[PDB]
């Protein structure tokens, strides 16, 4: 019962089908960038600007009303997770996302709620979808999130952010059982959560594996890949089996250029690349079947108007206007210019019409 | 006027021959993972236990007091550089590395020094080497060192380590001309520095572009490869003009996955390959000339000494025989067992025969 999708060019993009433009959103497009979301967030405290539907609302549309991008993402945090499995967090200005007891030990994972309690306590999230899906008003579809297994297991593990992630890894060669433990518990959380966004109006997913690169290959297959194919295996057939219909997923693993072939075969209807993976390369590792998204450096914003628009122009040419989404590497800094990400959207529109024209 | 080498297997390796087995050494094997390291570099600060010949020295053969490695680096600090540029270092044990007063505009670069007059500041290490290379007694080689001027550019501009390297690559975006003009300068300055290691008796150099993944591939062809390539095109020929036989130059791109085929054109007669490339498509993308280095996971060695044997095993299957030298993907962390690199290195021996009888 919301509203019809008036603009669905990046739902057809992301099913494989052929568009009139190339569709284009950005990873933190709800973000310090834009100054109206510092003021906004200076409302409380991270988790209580975040526990508002409003104000998720109200931080989501932000960016759109800047610029057409083609795309909402619900404005929250992947550590929302692992704090509704019963951990505390301590935001900090400084330091940022923080877990001020990390689990170091196999008996750590007995205070954890099981995962089948996750959704319950994340209903807050659900209502700001649901109201989100509302005020757009059927102008782009609302894309949903979370972060993938491996991913919000390290956040866990080391308590934060890591160069090395040595602490998680030595719990994979240390400790493999109570990993695998661990990453299945992520697992049974994340799938209600996730069907639960779409439920609540979601009208895509992305995973984010954000830490996929500290991982090589083989650790990479053996703990963060199977966890990924079982989470669109278990929303899939979740979704199907309450009448609704599924939503086209995405799979990001930031520096995992070397499981991009894996990652193809996943399940995902999509897979999101970093700026380092050349396009043509990527698109020789996944094959012709699934959907690639973005790639743009985000420092690349930090260029000229005109420097973005050749960039943009360049990367265009290297995807081809065939089963892509446009967006950037990674996400948007806090220092980048807000001018300069609409260049950025302005430049996608103008000249994938014109590789097509 | 140094002993004549004994053990010459890691430098028939780094020229492609066929060797009775496969050559391991391992960055950082002079570390903190060494209680006799920490006792060493505890006399005084780093820059003066580091600008004693003897101090650098009895690091150096530490390691080899206790594992059978085929080659040793001069122990030293790729902030030398910059340093004897005019920078001033604030090492701390907390942060570790860093620039208080880092580069940010244009006019900083005022500050530097000539980078011809570089090398007479580091003769201290000149004299470390020298010393070292003596004390060896030929019983393996001596390797010698440098940053690669991307990522000295970093440690400058950012005034420290970074997990996005936003100054150094706004920089890049923003200001490429003085970019060019400080990657020069830092080329001007490593050349002759890398000539004199050999002088003083470095038997092979290695570069360390550690922060090559910040880079996308066109960043990295813009302002990384045309100094890598600079510096071995330079230092050769400099080596020949002053009668001395040019030794093999290793280059380790830390995550430069992106890069491998441009870097095995480059002049260096070695790879470094870092964990997350798989050693088949390392091997593909390289070629059959040039010669790869390394790439075990470093944090694999948290894993048993029974299991390291076994990731060793499969390591040189996949690299196969020739032209391979065995290392790590990255250095060693301040946490693991001696014992554990002890087992690295004997299982290399081991199974590299093996693969061989």
Redesign the interface.
Known sequence: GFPELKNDTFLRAAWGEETDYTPVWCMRQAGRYLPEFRETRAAQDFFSTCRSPEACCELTLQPLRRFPLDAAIIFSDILVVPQALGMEVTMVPGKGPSFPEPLREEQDLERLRDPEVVASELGYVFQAITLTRQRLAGRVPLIGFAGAPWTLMTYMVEGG?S??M?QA??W???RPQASHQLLRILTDALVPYLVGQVVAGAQALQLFESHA?H?????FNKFALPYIRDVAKQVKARLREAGLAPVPMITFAK?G??ALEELAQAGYEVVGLD????PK?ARECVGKTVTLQGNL?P??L??SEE?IGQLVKQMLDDFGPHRYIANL?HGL?P?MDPEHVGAFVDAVHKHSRLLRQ
């Open positions: 952010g160069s090395t040595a890894k030595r994979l060669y240390q690169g991982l090589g290959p083989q650790l520096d250029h070397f700026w380092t993976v050349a390369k450096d420092c690349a930090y260029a420097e590497g800094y220092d």
